[PDB]
Amino acid sequence: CGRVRDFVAKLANNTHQHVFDDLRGSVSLSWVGDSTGVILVLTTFHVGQSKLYRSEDYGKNFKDITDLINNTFIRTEFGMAIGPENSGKVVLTAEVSGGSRGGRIFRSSDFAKNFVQTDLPFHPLTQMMYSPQNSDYLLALSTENGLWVSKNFGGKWEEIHKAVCLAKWGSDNTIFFTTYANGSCKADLGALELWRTSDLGKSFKTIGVKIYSFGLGGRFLFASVMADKDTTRRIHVSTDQGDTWSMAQLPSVGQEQFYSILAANDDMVFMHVDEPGDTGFGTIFTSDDRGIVYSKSLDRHLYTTTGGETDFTNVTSLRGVYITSVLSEDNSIQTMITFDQGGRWTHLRKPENSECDATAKNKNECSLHIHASYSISQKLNVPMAPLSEPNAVGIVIAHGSVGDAISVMVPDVYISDDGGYSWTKMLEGPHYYTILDSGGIIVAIEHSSRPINVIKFSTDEGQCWQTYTFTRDPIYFTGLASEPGARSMNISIWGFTESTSQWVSYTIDFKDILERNCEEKDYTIWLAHSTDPEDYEDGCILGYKEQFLRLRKSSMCQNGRDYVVTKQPSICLCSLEDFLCDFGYYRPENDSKCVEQPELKGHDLEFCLYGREEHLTTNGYRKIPGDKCQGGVNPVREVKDLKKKCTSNFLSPE
Ligand SMILES: *[C@@H]1O[C@H](CO)[C@@H](O[C@@H]2O[C@H](CO)[C@@H](O)[C@H](O)[C@H]2NC(C)=O)[C@H](O)[C@H]1NC(C)=O
Ligand SMILES: *[C@@H]1O[C@H](CO)[C@@H](O[C@@H]2O[C@H](CO)[C@@H](O)[C@H](O)[C@H]2NC(C)=O)[C@H](O)[C@H]1NC(C)=O
Ligand SMILES: CC(C)(C)C[C@H](NC(=O)c1ccc(Oc2ccccc2)nc1)C(=O)O
């Protein structure tokens, strides 16, 4: 059909083995910067001793640098604090003597080439956090609960506050943190104070009170605020770093419920609101571009009460595509997919040449169900969660089940080349997979109960595979290492030999497999989100289209480390479909027109009475966030008020 000829020769001289002799227990692997090849391995032992290795050739060869950390014991709760981008910043937390005045850290800012030692004025409680803006700025919590900041990459530490619960870096070196007054974090649960410092502990602005907790997501700063003389709380959103606050149009919750930021960006948020009483599911709400107005997107969305597992996934290889698991009335789990930012959810189309399993009532008609965080949690035979990379357009890889729900059977692997619109069985039985060279190479390793000595590769996006032997002595496979970003052609296989056992790492380079670099001819045109090509509006998702240039399945070549996904948008005309109901409006029947409510019930009346001037007055409609349509329809009607309609029933004081 189609395979690589004389491949065995091209890979043999490019297979680079490494034995990690004195290795057991812990095994931390950290990549340091992009286009560097710097990897750090950290093995800890318990009576203990710590070992540290460093590669500079993508894991092909390491050199023991335990000497650089004076062989001392390193705490793995803090792991390896690696700095942003290509700063080269690396921080290791050392375990210290019982009665010491403060902790100790090993800091390298030259890609682990040289480690300085530093004794701290406090005992750290959290892993130190690098300011996204400035790699030299760090923050940490002491075991005493004090917020310590550093401006010189952890050399000198200053205690900027003394009773902090949670602290986070914002954009432009801002620090947000909750503070308690009486007992502890647990005693003042819902009675904390949200503060902020733009001048690194110089000044402070109390941006919130009666605080339960806070979180950042995209352009937003969320904070859950406790109800006065009540056991409940609700969401409050600020988009100006705490200066102005607004109550989110969302249900309030009790103490046994939560709010989870499923996903957030520069346009909107996906918020999971927990269902009252141990149900193991909630409801997804999609926000407007202000993070204030919320549209109910998905019901009975599976998110566990203990452990907090959810199969909620962003199919990062196609714009507007997300998959998750819902809980059926009949207590079965089905996988749903949204192609339009959670506007509409539906089942995944089963692959053409696949039969329905025992879970399906009709042996002809059924769907594809994906195994993710939840299946894994239930100790099912799922070695990997769904995988997609933004640079490898349309490709989604996952362990699935074809039927009416997620089955307990041993899953085969499924691939989509168009962002989840159509599927096909990639491999049979569980595997571990990786996407090299922005979709140029897909790599697979079998999930076995006994040793393996083989790797499988594909140069046509999982349509055709090829077996390769990387070792004479088989290993008990553990996992795959590859450079974040899915741009390298360097894959590190990991595992341990048969015992008196020891860890090993074989790194295969695909430079010779893809000796030719891609040229203009190798790429083809591809309209993302196609359904009916006859249609003028075909591919319009969120008011616009995107046409891509994609490497041909046939074309086997290297996209290159500098590959730039080339796409062109087509601005479609506005329909009502590009608008969500603002506050006080609803879409009855099938109809796409936003009509005013007869009267506001539940959390809608709660907003109506305790909101603010801007959101309470409405155009009826609001443009869907991320929606970039032009022309066509527009909601033409005056910006009307509702603070009269709600209070109209309430007898008013004089
Ligand atoms: C789902 O994933 C996509 C792709 O990873 C996110 O989109 C990117 O967002 C960043 C934000 O800074 C942009 O600079 C990129 O241009 C976006 N990538 C692409 C390919 O569009 C998206 O935000 C994620 N969804 C949510 C809700 O966070
Ligand atoms: C795979 O690993 C090799 C190193 O083992 C990478 O080689 C680097 O290549 C760049 C140019 O592409 C050079 O500037 C570096 O000096 C090379 N480093 C070494 C140690 O040889 C190679 O880039 C990796 N392959 C891919 C596709 O990322
Ligand atoms: C701070 C903000 C705005 C994010 C809300 C806040 N959130 C949270 O406390 C919160 C709790 C849990 C959780 O996941 C789970 C983890 C384990 C088990 C079950 C669930 N995720 C988030 C709140 O509920 O008030």
Side-chain angles (χ1 to χ4, degrees):
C1 53
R3 313 282 170 94
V4 178
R5 295 166 188 270
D6 296 337
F7 68 90
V8 250
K10 317 179 190 168
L11 291 163
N13 226 301
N14 280 310
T15 299
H16 312 91
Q17 184 213 11
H18 190 110
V19 198
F20 297 85
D21 294 284
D22 294 77
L23 212 169
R24 212 68 24 88
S26 176
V27 230
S28 270
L29 184 162
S30 301
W31 286 81
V32 197
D34 200 53
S35 310
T36 91
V38 185
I39 305 179
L40 281 177
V41 185
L42 175 60
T43 152
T44 81
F45 299 76
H46 297 82
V47 180
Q49 52 172 13
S50 261
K51 283 273 254 166
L52 173 74
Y53 316 96
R54 176 204 189 279
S55 175
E56 204 168 36
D57 63 355
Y58 285 76
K60 282 168 183 162
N61 275 279
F62 294 80
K63 264 86 214 183
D64 175 15
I65 59 161
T66 308
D67 274 13
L68 273 147
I69 58 105
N70 278 359
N71 295 264
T72 64
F73 205 25
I74 302 298
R75 291 172 74 83
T76 27
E77 307 90 278
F78 307 107
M80 293 195 271
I82 311 303
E85 284 135 305
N86 292 46
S87 59
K89 309 269 167 82
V90 175
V91 174
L92 271 73
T93 305
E95 190 182 14
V96 302
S97 175
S100 288
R101 65 166 293 268
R104 213 184 274 122
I105 56 148
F106 281 88
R107 41 194 211 91
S108 160
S109 70
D110 61 338
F111 294 85
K113 274 181 179 299
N114 290 283
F115 278 88
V116 200
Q117 179 181 307
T118 299
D119 290 275
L120 314 151
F122 58 95
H123 280 280
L125 171 59
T126 76
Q127 177 194 44
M128 290 163 201
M129 312 302 310
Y130 292 88
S131 184
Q133 202 84 5
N134 199 318
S135 12
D136 297 56
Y137 295 8
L138 316 180
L139 65 80
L141 275 223
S142 86
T143 51
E144 292 301 306
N145 293 292
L147 179 52
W148 292 78
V149 186
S150 171
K151 302 176 158 192
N152 62 322
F153 177 53
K156 277 91 207 171
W157 289 85
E158 205 249 298
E159 189 175 20
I160 72 142
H161 204 281
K162 283 201 175 199
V164 303
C165 299
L166 170 72
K168 289 170 172 204
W169 281 115
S171 49
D172 326 299
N173 305 288
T174 332
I175 307 104
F176 297 93
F177 57 92
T178 45
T179 54
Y180 62 101
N182 284 313
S184 55
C185 314
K186 218 101 178 193
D188 302 338
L189 178 79
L192 313 160
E193 286 214 11
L194 180 68
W195 287 41
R196 178 198 92 196
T197 180
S198 314
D199 27 57
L200 301 121
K202 245 220 94 76
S203 80
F204 299 101
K205 177 171 198 184
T206 170
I207 58 168
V209 299
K210 272 282 227 286
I211 299 311
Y212 179 105
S213 194
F214 79 102
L216 300 156
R219 247 201 301 114
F220 319 98
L221 160 71
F222 297 100
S224 31
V225 193
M226 192 96 176
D228 299 77
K229 268 186 184 265
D230 211 342
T231 188
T232 66
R233 63 194 202 276
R234 65 168 63 253
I235 299 286
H236 284 259
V237 203
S238 172
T239 49
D240 57 348
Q241 306 229 279
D243 299 327
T244 63
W245 287 91
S246 337
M247 172 201 282
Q249 192 261 0
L250 277 176
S252 50
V253 290
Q255 282 149 355
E256 288 180 335
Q257 283 166 282
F258 63 92
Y259 292 121
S260 201
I261 317 302
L262 291 165
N265 60 21
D266 217 73
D267 312 322
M268 50 77 74
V269 299
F270 278 94
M271 187 85 77
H272 178 94
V273 167
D274 195 51
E275 228 38 43
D278 192 299
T279 33
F281 71 76
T283 296
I284 309 178
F285 289 91
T286 42
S287 87
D288 76 326
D289 57 297
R290 300 178 299 169
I292 299 151
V293 209
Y294 289 77
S295 176
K296 180 155 126 171
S297 169
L298 197 60
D299 269 330
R300 296 171 52 80
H301 163 244
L302 205 124
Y303 197 129
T304 77
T305 299
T306 12
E309 292 104 4
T310 190
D311 308 288
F312 184 89
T313 291
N314 179 354
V315 167
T316 61
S317 48
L318 193 55
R319 169 195 75 97
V321 182
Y322 307 86
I323 84 106
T324 193
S325 289
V326 292
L327 179 56
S328 198
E329 311 287 353
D330 30 297
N331 257 39
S332 51
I333 307 150
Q334 284 94 52
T335 299
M336 294 292 100
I337 183 163
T338 190
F339 295 117
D340 65 330
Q341 198 142 269
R344 193 195 148 268
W345 293 91
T346 173
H347 289 77
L348 273 73
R349 139 182 257 269
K350 55 168 260 62
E352 258 290 334
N353 302 336
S354 244
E355 280 163 32
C356 314
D357 70 357
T359 204
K361 60 178 163 239
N362 188 318
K363 209 177 184 178
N364 303 110
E365 294 226 337
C366 73
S367 9
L368 174 56
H369 297 270
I370 301 308
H371 288 287
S373 296
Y374 184 68
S375 300
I376 285 150
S377 88
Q378 308 300 275
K379 287 108 156 181
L380 270 219
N381 201 227
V382 181
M384 263 196 82
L387 170 91
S388 54
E389 301 272 12
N391 35 325
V393 158
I395 296 114
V396 209
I397 307 160
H399 288 105
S401 129
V402 174
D404 276 33
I406 304 163
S407 82
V408 303
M409 293 75 117
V410 169
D412 314 312
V413 196
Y414 299 93
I415 198 160
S416 180
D417 79 315
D418 61 9
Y421 274 89
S422 85
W423 300 84
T424 275
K425 204 187 289 172
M426 197 185 82
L427 309 169
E428 316 198 291
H431 287 83
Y432 292 85
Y433 37 76
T434 221
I435 306 174
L436 297 161
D437 191 65
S438 327
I441 309 279
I442 295 171
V443 148
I445 298 251
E446 202 209 81
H447 173 43
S448 191
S449 38
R450 259 182 73 241
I452 57 92
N453 67 288
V454 184
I455 199 159
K456 311 169 172 201
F457 65 84
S458 179
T459 76
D460 70 348
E461 294 164 350
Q463 253 167 11
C464 273
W465 290 87
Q466 263 163 295
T467 298
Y468 170 76
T469 286
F470 56 89
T471 184
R472 285 172 99 267
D473 323 297
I475 55 146
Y476 269 106
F477 186 78
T478 238
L480 290 158
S482 125
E483 183 215 59
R487 289 187 177 258
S488 97
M489 295 180 307
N490 293 321
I491 183 60
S492 296
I493 301 111
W494 288 74
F496 49 91
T497 52
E498 268 152 310
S499 68
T500 48
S501 180
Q502 268 186 5
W503 301 81
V504 79
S505 144
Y506 293 84
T507 302
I508 309 178
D509 192 335
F510 288 89
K511 59 174 206 85
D512 295 324
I513 281 287
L514 303 175
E515 80 115 281
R516 179 176 47 105
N517 297 1
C518 311
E519 34 208 272
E520 204 170 297
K521 56 139 139 281
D522 295 297
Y523 305 89
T524 176
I525 299 152
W526 181 74
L527 169 78
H529 297 271
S530 202
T531 297
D532 167 42
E534 286 279 312
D535 211 283
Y536 180 59
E537 250 98 36
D538 178 57
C540 293
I541 278 268
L542 255 56
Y544 67 108
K545 306 186 190 185
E546 288 198 321
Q547 295 242 2
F548 285 85
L549 278 176
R550 295 181 79 175
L551 203 62
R552 287 161 196 283
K553 282 164 168 66
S554 29
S555 287
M556 75 123 255
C557 41
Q558 181 215 43
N559 284 314
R561 286 200 66 89
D562 68 340
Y563 175 73
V564 158
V565 161
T566 134
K567 42 120 175 176
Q568 259 173 27
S570 306
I571 320 299
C572 323
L573 308 185
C574 302
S575 49
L576 292 167
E577 324 298 330
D578 299 288
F579 297 96
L580 52 96
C581 319
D582 197 325
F583 183 63
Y585 287 79
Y586 77 111
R587 277 187 163 99
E589 70 254 33
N590 279 271
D591 164 86
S592 311
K593 192 98 183 109
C594 291
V595 307
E596 204 178 288
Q597 280 266 26
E599 207 61 72
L600 335 97
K601 61 176 191 181
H603 65 276
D604 289 87
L605 184 80
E606 290 194 289
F607 192 26
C608 226
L609 296 153
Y610 313 77
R612 81 192 306 194
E613 209 180 22
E614 192 212 349
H615 350 310
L616 55 78
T617 207
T618 166
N619 195 43
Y621 293 80
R622 264 194 91 93
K623 207 163 239 214
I624 285 175
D627 197 308
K628 294 172 175 183
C629 56
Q630 65 156 43
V633 197
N634 191 275
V636 60
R637 53 178 88 184
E638 197 214 77
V639 50
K640 299 293 175 186
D641 218 298
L642 295 146
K643 70 198 156 209
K644 193 236 91 74
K645 189 212 189 153
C646 54
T647 75
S648 77
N649 323 281
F650 293 85
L651 171 87
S652 315
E654 44 134 58

